[PDB]
């Protein structure tokens, strides 16, 4: 013993001096002060002034790769932005060529990185970067298995994107999922029209995708075994996995544990929320919604019941008190996309974050990019590299565009935060961190205190409890509404990749937890021909939906840390972090690392805990929970799986 | 590789450097010097210039307690001292009121100290001080149990004090134990007179204290059992218990066997001593002590048979030969108690111990201040605190009081010696150290060498073996004689606390142990109605009687070590530590430590033996041991338990 | 937090410097230097000039021994040198008298060493010294057992030296082993005379040697068993044993494994070598040796078959191609013995090794000093100690003596290299390391480039490939041919010491391995009455013979390492080390270690491998192996044990 016992600050040393054993060096990492642990305290130690292995070759190989990678990635990034801004055939070709150049280049380095054995490589950053490169992808399988898996992904993504259903009343009248079916599942309130749209989408897509999905899963599973995973779920569980880090290693199975462990705390709030929606639905559809039965899968505000936000019309806590809107004030104050972005930039400056790049304005587009060029209006950030930061969207004078602008800007702030890190580390620690950071900025941007501070919300405006309940429930519909849907679906892919559910029970098991975990009942029964669990975008397009679940746990914890940092006074849903420079600095310390460090370390450095939890959400919706329990003390609370609209 | 080991002191590492492997850095916590262990020596590495937790709160909690504890204890000691030296109603009020507030102060800080656990404390001193504070004692039980236990002790204290037995000849003529009954069996040699007083007290006290003793023992055990002890004997055995110290841990059960083992090897010396007393008692009581039977209880020169000092008149080795006493020379030089205490002060400066403050002398009652105010003449020490010291003794100009002055001042020097220790640690290592220090110096003072040096004894005094045996036997009767009685009484009390001796067999086993361990048999058959063991002041008032046996073992070890350090030659009873400055410095090494260190470490450093032993006892009385065998060859050696004066 | 990392040796530091993080202070005990670790390298920190127990007693006792031992050994060496240079009765006594006094000094020092145990020494060098002196060896037995070993050892030595066999035709014509019997089997090619010489020697001398060798074997086993060995074979294996060194321990049992493992790898080379010699023996003895059976024992060029170079007259690959001979140039250039050593001195200077000092020329004779005083013409290297190194040889103007002087020069330079060690540690690592140094110097002196550089080889000479084959086969007969003989003899001597085979099969086992391991069958069967295993000098003189097998393994490894530094291109046997200073410095570092450091580390330092390996042996004779396989593909390869000339 009597070795190196080093920590960050002297305050840690004062609290841990009794912990440090006799003879152990007390080195303060931040203060660069060295002390020796002696009898009842520490003594000052004299310090002087600050001054071919394969691992050395790997460092040369890795850095050399970066310079090539930076250039080629920029070409692919630019080709994408040009194609995204203007969808033309020429824009496609360069995107293909740059992507083909980029993809081919990466595998050569991937194979070359695999030539380096990581066991003899001890640098934490270097070893992580190499394995981040040594990943061979689908090439770990055979080419034909890679060919099948990729082509199916091309087809499955195409089928979901091109999934179009036709009503039996008119064969020629066919409506896509968007905007045809989704508007019907959200805006239309007809029992049959929503039932048909829900049924037809899962019929013409699920039946076609089910054979493709069956082969897709095993292809994804066998590569996971080829990549040393129990299933492709564990392959996606390796994304949050932390290995080799003392005090921060995160096992893949722990991801399943934490998601289920945190989900059980959401059930009581959700159950009363589920009962209240059932209580409100039975006020609108008493026949279609039983007081004890589950909520029909076609009356949930969207195709799959993913979000209950569109049910706010039928489940409004207080019709006389609408949600706080300052979009008209923006119209009154003549605010527009550049103004909103400038206000967002000012808000980011308000929390101490640096002002965003001016080159963004020259390069990125905010409003609708006309019609000659073809572009997507969805909020999309663009960290093209080499200091090139952009956001591609059509921003109008609306809160949603205002909030998503904050959501997208936070990504860019995160993008430049880890831009100092190498290209391999130039990304978020996990898939949900950047999105979670984007959300909390929008949430703070949506705070009425911020709106009142900036003048969007008038000073004489009052935030009554009914409005807060209206706000919280709308938050619950958006956030807590999708949590059970996210929890089961990701867990569904977990067991499907693990093969727990046999082919002849994928649909039956889906409806088993639909009515039980989520309390959602299919209006008409579906069999294994249907592939409704894969009918969503992420499952069809092979995206781990856990990102939404993880970020929601992260964002509330981060916001809770923000509220603690900003010293919020009031309801947690009213927590505004405006004019809180220190919180941005603390957030910057997390964001500056990006993915250079384990996400558990970053999570603890912000919220104080190395594990995600839903404790802020319970605090966030605590007044709402009491109101929901008060509203549900009369109506039945829970859900009966046996009941169904078809029986 | 290599390791670094730190030393508190440079000299400890210098003597522990050869076994250190080469390459280990040599660092000392005091000199802060850098050395590297190299081949056959060490190279001095050049060094540059010098550049919450419960335990820290625990350290601060103790220090604040020490300030108020030192103040209130000083007032309590002062108030009690006034009552002793001046026995008046108001002085009694001061002694009671100050003690009550001190008692109230002790429990309040003890309760507050309970919120400072001992396990997380790294400092043994900090943990030990709180452990003394956190000792709930009788309060671990319910409040009624403590009150009734004190009620028994109050009744035990009053009854023992007021125990008066009336002579059958005159019912009005009644005598208390002190000084009436004690003088009967110490001065009067009439067997019947001693027998009546011995039986009357044990009958009167026994019939009223036996039922109280049964309950008092149970109450003492129950709190000990709740205080994690097997019995109240183990509760008292925790005084010598050592825990948490490497190389010096002492267990409570180790105390039992050490006292037993030490006494067993004393028996061959004691059996000859018992035989000679038995042989000499026949010369005065031919029909009352058998040549093989055990000694009569009241024929031992004292009340309980504890001290055989008065038997020296009847069992003198050579009555014609004089005894070591310069009491006449004390008054031939026109001295007094003040000069006697001055000689006691001269004794400490002769052995090298520093002189004490004059404040002690001006506050100490060395002689009774007349008769208008009553001064308690019971020898005691007063470590009042804040450097205040007093001696409660009506010392006169006599050799007997000359040793008493040395004995009491020995406690005072010891009490001030560990003043550097905290108030909780301002005490002796155990209950047999301060008495040991004062006894050995008095014995050294009583030697002819000390008396001749200061002119108390003429140099023409004949230091022949005739006076050597007479002095040894008188010391043996006082010191060696009380060891068998002290050992059994604590052993008997231990089994009563442990419940081993049946309640209907306490009296028989007490005398059976007296018959066997001590070779002393009661003159009248006492049943369990009697409470002869509790007739002692210590047993009734709940005083651990093992302190005297340990003190006797410690003092001889202390004395022999001083004589060995002073290069004493010849019989050990003539050893004088006067004019030996090294002996006091050697003695003072433990005296400053006090009770912070284990007593085993204290005993080993002073003497050389970690545990107790009887080797100094054999060295002190070796001429007597051979002399006893010469006188005891004509009579039985040992004792016979069956014989009794009543049968 | 960097801290300090310490290495005892540079090799440990360099081998571990890669894993040292930047900024770590690095200290090397051997170099007494400070280093600061940086990226992909280390930076040295400059320094100024260097600044009771049994361990202390042992160092003093050993240090005083070395100086005294050097003198007495030098006196014994001085007298022995005079005895060998001058064969006179006076010189015989001086060698014995100085030797006896020196031997008595070792015995006295050994007695004083036995009280200094090795385990209590914290200095590795000090512990090793007493180990080599505390070895009682033959003295662990009784005086009579030691006495009876000495007489038989000399008796079997004298009988071997005075092996007298007389021709049956002429009783008075008796030829001794040297030069009579040896020349018969070396120069004379008559099968019958060699058959008689081999048979008569092993018959008359074998009968006399057998009781002496068997008794000597048992006694050598008895002492070794009492010396903590399984047998006397293990006693000799203890010289090569290394224990207690991390990464360098060598066990005695592994020596048996390594010898057997290496010999199996040499079998493919030897089977073709045996086949070709068998093919060539048929060209001269078609009626005695078959193409399938083994070889006659006397048809190996010697009675024991140790040296097969005498067969080169009948087994030459090409009788017309000249070998590497420069004796003509030596005579033409008027060279003598002094020029040979001077040319050896020039070669050693060119390679960087130090030149021979003044004491060599002034004290060491180089030619036989006429008939006035007889000089032992056997070439011996005389390390008399205390700066006295001498070479004894009857060197003539010949190429053979030119190599032999280099052989003695290698030993002399080997001896002086480890002079920095104490006298006890001033010895070779084992019994095969030192002999390897001499042979390679002769091999280096035999290289064509060295002769050409010094003018011995005419530059106009053409080095044909066939000449290389003849050179390699001639070298193979001397060295590669002797490997099977050394393996079986040591394996047989392992059995006789360990007693794995009863005495009635010792000779049967000796020829069994001759038929199988060596592929050589005795022309006349021999029973246990003979002592053919002891017919060699070392077996008949209590000398291990495995030292030469280790010598062969070490010398080629040494030869490979020297060419590795020289970076020679082409055949290994054509490599030269002239004008290669870096090779000599590394070689001298190998020679300066002596026995103070493990030979496994020394073998690692020179080459890189800590275990035995036969790659240099195959590399040196790589053209020879292909030539033998090409020539022996038309003939039977291997041997048949059953076949015999007498059967």
Residue numbers in the entry:
A (entry chain E), B (entry chain A), C (entry chain C): 1 to 51, 1019 to 1614
Question: Can you quote the paper on this entry?
Answer:
We describe the development of a biologic that takes advantage of the proximity of the N-terminus of bound ACE2 to the three-fold symmetry axis of the spike protein to create an ultrapotent, trivalent ACE2 entry antagonist. Therefore, we sought trimeric scaffolds to fuse three ACE2 moieties and leverage the inherent symmetry of the spike trimer to maximize avidity. Thus, we determined a trimeric antagonist fused to the N-terminus of ACE2 would require a short peptide linker and would be less likely to form inter-spike interactions. The collagen VIII trimerization domain is significantly larger than the collagen XVIII domain (44.7 kDa and 19.3 kDa, respectively), but more importantly, previous studies reported that collagen VIII melts at ~45 °C66, whereas the collagen XVIII domain melts at ~85 °C (vide infra). Given these observations, the smaller, more thermally stable collagen XVIII trimerization domain was advanced to develop the trimeric antagonist.
To simplify the nomenclature, we refer to these constructs as TXA, where ‘T’ indicates the collagen XVIII trimerization domain, ‘X’ refers to the number of residues in the linker, and ‘A’ refers to ACE2. Next, we turned to cryo-EM single-particle analysis with trimeric antagonists bound to SARS-CoV-2 spike trimer to validate the design. Starting with the 3-amino acid linker construct (T3A), we observed electron density for the spike protein, each of the three ACE2 moieties, and collagen XVIII trimerization domain of the T3A. The electron density between the trimerization domain and ACE2 moieties was discontinuous, reflective of the flexibility of the 3-amino acid linker. Moreover, modeling of the trimerization domain presents the “axis” as slightly ‘tilted’ (nonparallel) with respect to the C3 symmetry axis of the spike protein. We then attempted to evaluate the ‘symmetry of interaction’ between our ACE2 constructs with spike protein (T0A-S, T3A-S, T5A-S, and T18A-S; where S is the SARS-CoV-2 spike HexaPro protein) by likening the C3 symmetry to an equilateral triangle with all sides being equal length and a corresponding standard deviation between these lengths of zero (s.d. = 0). Thus, we calculated lengths (distances) and corresponding standard deviations between the Cα atoms of equivalent residues in the RBDs of the spike protein (residue D428; as determined by Fan et al.) and in each of the ACE2 domains (residue N137; arbitrarily determined residue on ACE2) (red and black dashed lines, respectively). The calculated mean distances and s.d. between spike RBD were: 41 ± 3.6 Å for T0A-S; 40 ± 1.0 Å for T3A-S; 40 ± 1.0 Å for T5A-S; and 42 ± 3.2 Å for T18A-S. Equating lower s.d. values to symmetry, we determine T3A and T5A to have higher symmetry than T0A or T18A.
